[PDB]
Design a protein around this ligand. Structure first.
Ligand code: HEM
Ligand code: HEM
Lengths: 361, 363
């Protein structure tokens, strides 16, 4: 049973190895009391220490007083830690509370409206987020379900998204997204300490001292028009990305990890427009997950990519790259239907520290 | 990661060990051409052979004519079979088509209305279903997607349900999974090794009155929402009283081990296990094979959570119906609500490479 250390200078779940499953939940805060919210962050941190070690929260899921509800709802009993990481983030709307308005980082910028946005307000925004990643989806769901229960009366669940990537028990190998293309070939790796400092981690010179060691998260629920995509020819699909579908190699190259020659790609191929060379060097840490929630009323597959990007500054990461996708040939086949941004605070340093301690003090 | 044999006297995915993930899809038929629908069954069967072996459908996911869409959508490239099983069923409404009226099995009975039902007609019923079970969700989605794509113009997806984790067991030698109420679910089920119990309670026999159905089974699907807010503020004793088993071990009340036999008189008269036990239902026994689901939030600040209940039986009238009628006074009813329902006749297995889904009905 593998576990990921909860404590560190950075929150786990960003540069740590990508787990198979995701349960992402945005919460809205319903209390105005700063002291009550800080108390909740401490209880949540205590619970997160237990959950990421594979233990039940509080006094356990059974064996307590019969007249009392158990502290843990119990559906993770007998399961492994499953590399569970719990990553918290603070939304822009949180800073309108608790007198925090002047502590919102400038790097936590509102996203502009992008062409083709069809954002569902109910699946967007949120005062805070908890990203729960694990190899077992029931471990992730158990974590979110119990954090929400502990927070009841102080927070509510605004929206939640289940996601999946590869299945590590059977898969060695770049995963493929639901379009059939390898996804993640040219990404910041967790082993690239220098590129993380340059592009992912907030530094104290960036202007917000309490965010040092943290990062900024952009979440985009991107629906795929599956049935339209599946009717396109193989050449159209490969032209859209600039990589072949079988190997994932850039056009004109042989291997997946051959560095691309952007001029051989069509001008509005996804890779050519998203590449850092096309965006003044802007580089992103993509950590998204595929989703399939079912089928809509027309019988179409409600599926897509729950896109998650971590970066040092939203204005120099997601925004320029996404702006450059305005003519992306991929736009024919996708629609952004949900969006949120979060400031992901630094890590919990030790057993006495707590989520958001550098912001709330 | 290994493959589950596709051929057999029975369809796989019933007595098969329960895989981690579920993608259940109900289809409606849009063609009146019996020959066109038979051709779709053969085309689906050939696809299933490829999918359950871990191979792309048709000519493959790439390498073909650049100007044509690939035969396989390709998102399962490089993945193992992952114990994928594909189980097809026929809904009662199918038999209004293709001159099949007199071939409806009597064991494929319409369920009566049960107290507490709030069935959404959009996520209920269906001419046919495909149950895709696999350990890898992408493998299960890939199978359903390519089957639906192959069936474009002849079938449409009516509704689908994804199960993120199993709440059932056909392998008592393995650890029993827990449902979202935190209890072990599947302790006293029918095991895939229990050939005598499967013949008695699961597989239809020729003497049951419908010859084409011999070796098949009958499927009841019930989408059940859980009131987890109400459940999570119940005391431990209340929760254990609801079921008649303790929460930690899952042992019957008063007993020490999960698989000790229940002593029914020690549970509350409205305990779920006491009411659902075969001894309480004239011996009626089910093969439960359900999965948990969560489809976001309920719009009221809470996680949506539920159980997609799947039951296989020799005859719906002698399996699910008497058991569900006896759960009218179930203490669990305070915490659940049936919101979707569908029954299907699950035809016999594909015998070999020449055979095809539904061949005994059509053929
Ligand atoms: C459903 C939506 C999307 C799909 C299916 C998709 C798919 C892909 C694929 C197949 C690649 C090439 C393989 C790789 O290097 O990972 C790629 C690259 C990339 N994509 Fe996307 N993408 C989507 C949305 C986005 C969005 C919204 C952004 C940013 C705003 C983005 C940014 C990038 C970047 C930075 C790369 C790396 C390019 C490089 O450095 O070579 N993608 N994507
Ligand atoms: C959300 C819905 C349900 C939940 C959470 C649930 C939970 C449980 C639990 C915890 C057990 C004890 C462990 C076991 O033997 O599996 C059990 C047993 C059982 N349940 Fe349910 N159940 C649900 C719905 C149903 C329904 C609708 C039926 C039938 C119509 C049913 C039939 C049975 C049967 C036959 C047993 C085995 C009893 C025995 O032979 O000892 N369950 N269930």
């Amino acid at each position: 049973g593998s576990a990921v250390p909860f404590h560190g200078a950075h929150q786990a779940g960003i540069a740590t190895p990508v787990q198979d499953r995701l349960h992402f939940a945005a919460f809205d805060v319903t209390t105005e009391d700063r002291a009550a919210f800080v108390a909740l962050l401490k209880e949540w941190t205590a619970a997160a220490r237990r959950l990421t070690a594979g233990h039940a929260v509080g006094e356990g899921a059974y064996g307590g007083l019969p007249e009392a509800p158990p502290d843990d709802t119990g559906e993770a009993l007998g399961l492994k830690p499953s590399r569970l990481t719990l990553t918290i983030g603070f939304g822009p709307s949180l800073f309108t509370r608790f007198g925090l308005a002047d502590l919102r980082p400038e790097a936590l910028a509102d996203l502009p409206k992008f062409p083709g946005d069809n954002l569902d307000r109910a699946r967007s925004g949120g005062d805070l987020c908890v990203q729960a990643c694990a190899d077992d989806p029931q471990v992730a769901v158990h974590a979110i379900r119990n954090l929400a229960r502990i927070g009841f009366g102080k927070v509510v669940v605004r929206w939640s998204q289940l996601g999946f990537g590869k299945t590590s028990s059977t898969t060695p190998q770049t995963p493929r997204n639901l379009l059939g293309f390898k996804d993640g070939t040219r990404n910041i790796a967790g082993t690239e300490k220098d590129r993380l400092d340059r592009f992912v981690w907030a530094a104290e010179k960036d202007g917000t001292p309490w965010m040092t060691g943290g990062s900024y998260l952009v979440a985009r629920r991107i629906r795929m028009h599956i049935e339209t995509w599946d009717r396109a020819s193989l050449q159209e699909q490969e032209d859209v990305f600039g990589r072949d579908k079988g190997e994932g190699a850039p056009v004109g190259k042989a291997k997946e990890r051959d560095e691309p020659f952007l001029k051989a790609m069509k001008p509005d191929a996804h890779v050519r427009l998203a590449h850092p060379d096309s965006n003044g060097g802007a580089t992103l840490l993509r950590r998204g997950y595929s989703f399939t929630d079912g089928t809509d009323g027309l019988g179409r597959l409600d599926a897509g990519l729950f896109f998650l990007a971590y970066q040092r500054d939203i204005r120099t990461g997601f925004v320029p790259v996404q702006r450059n996708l305005a003519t992306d040939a991929l736009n024919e086949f996708i629609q952004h239907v949900g969006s949120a941004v979060f400031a992901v605070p630094p890590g919990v340093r030790d057993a006495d520290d707590w989520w958001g301690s550098t912001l709330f003090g």
